[PDB]
């Protein structure tokens, strides 16, 4: 209870008003501060113990951001729109050594969100589900985190069907993008760690912190 899709949508709206790799990294760092604010706007998130709020954010920040800029790029032809309002095209990503992962973002996420015309309410519920990941290690009470996740997709399921009566399977379709998001989020992390190791590519404070241990 007390997990309405109206609150989630508001959250999504309340936050988002020369090297391409360095640009994408600065946008990520900038979006991390906003991500925290976003999470606080998701009902019940703040009522959880601070220790679990840290685990959930550190555990899902990457997928939370990939999902956001992906939906934001729905109007971009072959590229993505960065928080800094700057663009990154397929060719530019390819010329930076990250062509493969960039394309997976376009094919598995961006293009798909556009084809099904995923709305901001659906995106928010998806992100809230990711946020409330009960598999996160360290959680003091993985039970409550699981309870929250269930309420999110429950309100989402109701939102769907009602908003899209012609599409009985729209709900399941949404959830089925999560496996791709997990995989793509994991590949993004491997890249980042390598970048940090090498030394090149400027990495801001907040983004650097997420790459810390554990």
């Amino acid at each position: 209870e007390d997990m309405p899709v109206e609150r989630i949508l508001e959250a999504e709206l309340a936050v988002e008003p020369n090297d391409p790799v360095t640009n994408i990294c600065q946008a990520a760092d900038k979006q991390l501060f906003t991500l925290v604010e976003w999470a606080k706007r998701i009902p019940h998130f703040s009522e959880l113990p601070l220790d679990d709020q840290v685990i959930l954010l550190r555990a899902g920040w990457n997928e939370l951001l990939i999902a956001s800029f992906s939906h934001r790029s729905i109007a971009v032809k072959d590229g993505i729109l960065l928080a800094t309002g700057l663009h990154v095209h397929r060719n530019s990503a390819h010329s930076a050594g990250v062509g493969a992962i960039f394309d997976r973002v376009l094919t598995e996420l961006v293009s798909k969100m556009r084809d099904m015309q995923m709305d901001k309410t659906e995106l928010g519920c998806l992100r809230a589900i990711v946020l409330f990941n009960p598999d996160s290690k360290g959680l003091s009470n993985p039970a409550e985190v699981e309870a929250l996740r269930e309420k999110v997709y429950a309100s989402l399921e109701a939102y769907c069907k009602h908003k899209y009566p012609e599409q009985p399977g729209r709900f399941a379709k949404l959830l089925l993008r999560l496996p791709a998001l997990r995989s793509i989020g994991l590949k993004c992390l491997e890249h980042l760690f390598f970048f940090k190791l090498i030394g090149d590519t400027p990495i801001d404070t907040f983004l650097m912190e997420m790459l810390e241990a554990p």
Binding site: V36, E37, L50, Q53, V54, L57, R58, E209, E212
Partner: peptide, 11 residues
């Protein structure tokens, strides 16, 4: 550890 993250969540 996790300096930044804690400060932002607390405020």
């Amino acid at each position: 550890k996790h300096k930044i993250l804690h400060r932002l969540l607390q405020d």
